[PDB]
Design a protein around this ligand. Structure first.
Ligand SMILES: Cc1cn([C@H]2C[C@H](O)[C@@H](COP(=O)(O)OP(=O)(O)O[C@H]3O[C@@H](C)[C@H](O)[C@@H](O)[C@H]3O)O2)c(=O)[nH]c1=O
Ligand SMILES: Cc1cn([C@H]2C[C@H](O)[C@@H](COP(=O)(O)OP(=O)(O)O[C@H]3O[C@@H](C)[C@H](O)[C@@H](O)[C@H]3O)O2)c(=O)[nH]c1=O
Ligand SMILES: Cc1cn([C@H]2C[C@H](O)[C@@H](COP(=O)(O)OP(=O)(O)O[C@H]3O[C@H](C)[C@H](O)[C@H](O)[C@H]3O)O2)c(=O)[nH]c1=O
Ligand SMILES: Cc1cn([C@H]2C[C@H](O)[C@@H](COP(=O)(O)OP(=O)(O)O[C@H]3O[C@H](C)[C@H](O)[C@H](O)[C@H]3O)O2)c(=O)[nH]c1=O
Lengths: 448, 448
């Protein structure tokens, strides 16, 4: 039995859910209380601890890599990157070494969807992670690397998914500054079954999620990544680049740099000092590796990575003949698999550039940091994955560009719909850009 | 000025060219003579030579890697692969070390197109390569890694291409058994300019190329790779998997293996012996590294890689509700960037399996090797890139599967149109499958 190649398009159902803020389970204004109710339901204290007091983690002796004795979860290893300016690369030349998080197994980031009263809802999970600054945020229905579990609720809907019910299934990369070539499987799958409901789960329409997306530190990094992959229909199907032209532009960005990376032992990393409490850069930039104990009120100890300052991640937006475009950058990070990924107009931790002249600041940073309320279309503070990162936060913005811009090398005007289409594939849209696409789609569905 | 996202579709022009065998420059039956005329035009002798007699190549002392003293062209290094069966990978367990070709710079494989008498033609190049078994085959208009040239004819049409004239621009990977993560930029670009014509170039319609594609050792590996990317319109837009279902199936294949690879010094490779003339495997499988001198009648010396036997590469085909599907395999090779790529139903050098029991032969090999003329839809012998490979040939087949098959794990029925659509992106379709897609598209346009 063959079917049409575009069989079972969910675009109309997705649209109806995004337009609806009346959900079956909970009023949107009550979710904040529900989260607090879940946070209070078992108190966790996360305390920073010397590395020596890590329980089942150690620095293994030959490599000095920070590893869990069972061989599960992740490792902290070393990375050496060179970008050449020579031939076969445009440069400029860059070279550095750093600690890096490694985790070779693809994990599942799965959102279960089901219709109630004729409107799709999505089963969000109130999930405690040790590095969440507010402890509990809303994660996907299933957020798990399977072999980290000797028992994950609802995992069977994603392992394998029913192929008749897949809305989204794609691998997408995570932060290329701090993880070495990490991607997880982003999935949205429908069911008609009665689904068991545990206290930590709430069915929400996409319109309820769109409102919640404007709130700080509420919808977690993994939820924003998976929701960014939703295949909306394009309402304005024109763009400055045709889709082939955009693929060609990006092909040239991925071909024009000469980046060589190698994984090295953590003990070999130059420029970083390993103390009794932290591994930190010698000039206090970038991030630190630290250790925490997690106690309930169940317990464990683990490394986490913390950044040195609040980050700034922004898209500049311009309407071109009436069609909104965002200015992407084809960014070259050390942990990327295929040299480049598209990223927001500005993506940086500003302190990392404070030592350099104003003209080596990230392009457009000044413009974003000093923008008027009137040009700010979206602003919120979101944090990164709390299983690996301790309180790593950034101001995520969408700002109208007050005047035309000639994009500098490495930048291009692309529509959000073109970004939505590329999320069918991996290594095109980076995690920060995926978060801002989820924010743009939320602002469109439920504006404030 | 925005344009429609699907602006400037070339599908009707491509179709008209594929239907036309009356070309402006040459009758198709005369091309064989023209090639011989170009071969005779300057005779080259390629002779095998001991490694010692390599001129500007050496085994560098710390690594033992085979390198050109100028730092251009490619290197032969070592590779160590493990596939784990543990947990986080399906297995089975595999582990081996081998020499491998490395060349980090993306090269250009560019075909220039232009209308004559209202029909697109493509400017093919009669190109001598030292490893071509018959010396001269038809390559793309531009076939060059730019920094290997201190001066490449027509390169300016591809560097950068005119964005208003791009038909195809995409990176595609080469053999994952013998190259380490190598992709080149496959491009087809139109011009309305009068183009200079040198004696080694001939304008051909796509229908002329389709006829030439049925000939042995005529249209070279790089030309078949780039022509496989042509975006034909789908005449039958149904398939067993919807396009999302196919992406989901492939996502699970790319997530379910645990492959770890590292580049090592050639001197460290176990299981291979380096002699005065060849590096070869201790049990005489796989390939050898050898050295050749190339003399005109201009000269140089270089390594080449030769395989141990004629290869067999085949698609099995079945009509499913009237729609032809081919049985792809999601193949796991050591040089791939992203774990898997789709490959033909059968892709092997049979001698590499002669030591193992009949039940560890590649699935379907027996069926392909013993197929009836009546079930053979396409058969030809094609060789691989003659700049790196000495006489590496395989029988490329498309065969009707005499009965339904339940695909084994790692295999799936996909339509050729779905493969054509995935060639807009890299790392989905491997080079052997791209060659068979070009052959399927040739058999459809100009059947024999
Ligand atoms: C980590 C590191 C970086 N570098 C170089 C690499 C880069 O060229 C430059 C900036 O480093 P990056 O890690 O790319 O930081 P950045 O400030 O440019 O970007 C950051 O943006 C925040 C919004 C994100 O949350 C972070 O994950 C990161 O992407 O410094 C070093 O020289 N040494 C180092 O140890
Ligand atoms: C090279 C090598 C391979 N192996 C293992 C890896 C694979 O599991 C198995 C088969 O090796 P492969 O190189 O994949 O050979 P193969 O015979 O399976 O496939 C070949 O098909 C021909 C049509 C292509 O032209 C070749 O480039 C290659 O892909 O042997 C070793 O154990 N040692 C080695 O040195
Ligand atoms: C790190 C650690 C944990 N635990 C426990 C605590 C957790 O409850 C459980 C699993 O923990 P983790 O969430 O770290 O493992 P996963 O649920 O697999 O989540 C990871 O993978 C996902 C797919 C997402 O990417 C997620 O963001 C990522 O963190 O194991 C330890 O006992 N000791 C330890 O050292
Ligand atoms: C290898 C060698 C060559 N030459 C000369 C001979 C050639 O005429 C010229 C360039 O040669 P090559 O074709 O090897 O280099 P490219 O034209 O860059 O072709 C390579 O890259 C392409 C994009 C295609 O992938 C092609 O298949 C691939 O081979 O340089 C040497 O003088 N000494 C030597 O060691």
């Amino acid at each position: 039995a063959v079917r049409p190649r575009d069989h079972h398009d969910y675009a109309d159902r997705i649209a109806l859910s995004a337009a609806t803020t009346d959900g079956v389970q909970m009023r949107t204004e009550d979710v904040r209380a529900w989260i607090a109710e879940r946070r209070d339901a078992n108190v966790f204290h996360v305390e920073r601890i010397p590395f020596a007091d890590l329980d089942q983690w150690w620095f293994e002796g030959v490599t000095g890599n920070l590893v869990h004795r069972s061989g599960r979860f992740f490792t902290i290893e070393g990375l050496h990157v060179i970008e050449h300016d020579g031939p076969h690369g445009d440069g400029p030349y860059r070279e550095w070494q750093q600690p890096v998080i490694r985790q070779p197994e693809v994990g599942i980031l799965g959102i279960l969807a089901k219709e109630f009263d004729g409107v799709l809802h999505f089963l969000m999970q109130a999930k405690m992670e040790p590095g969440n600054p507010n402890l509990v945020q809303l994660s996907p229905t299933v957020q798990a690397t399977r072999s980290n579990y000797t028992n994950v609720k609802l995992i069977e809907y994603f392992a394998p998914p029913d192929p008749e019910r897949v809305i989204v299934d794609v691998l997408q990369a995570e932060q290329g500054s701090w993880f070495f070539r990490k991607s997880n499987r982003n999935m949205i799958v429908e069911t008609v079954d009665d689904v068991p409901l545990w206290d930590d789960f709430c069915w929400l329409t996409l319109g309820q999620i769109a409102e919640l997306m404007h709130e700080d530190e509420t919808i977690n990094m993994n939820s924003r990544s998976v929701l960014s992959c939703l295949p909306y229909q394009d309402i304005t199907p024109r763009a400055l680049f045709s889709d082939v032209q955009l693929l060609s532009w990006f092909t040239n960005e991925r071909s024009r740099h000469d980046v060589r990376v190698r994984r090295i032992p953590l003990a070999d990393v130059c420029g970083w000092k390993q103390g009794a409490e932290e591994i930190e850069h010698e000039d206090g930039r970038y991030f630190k590796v630290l250790a925490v104990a997690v106690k309930g009120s169940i317990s464990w100890t683990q490394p986490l990575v913390e950044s040195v300052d609040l980050g700034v991640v922004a898209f500049l937006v311009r309407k071109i003949d009436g069609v909104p475009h965002v200015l992407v950058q084809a960014r070259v990070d050390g942990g990327f698999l295929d040299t480049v990924e598209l990223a927001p107009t500005v993506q940086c931790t500003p302190l990392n550039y404070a030592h350099l002249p104003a003209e080596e600041a990230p392009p457009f940073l000044d413009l974003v940091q000093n923008a008027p309320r009137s040009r700010i279309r979206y602003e919120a503070i979101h944090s990164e994955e709390g299983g690996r990162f301790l309180g790593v936060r950034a101001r995520y913005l969408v700002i109208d560009a007050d005047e035309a811009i000639d994009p500098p090398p490495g930048y291009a005007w692309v529509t959000p719909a073109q970004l939505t289409a590329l999320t069918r594939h991996g290594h095109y849209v980076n995690v920060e850009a995926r978060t801002l696409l989820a924010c743009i789609n939320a602002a469109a569905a439920q504006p404030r």
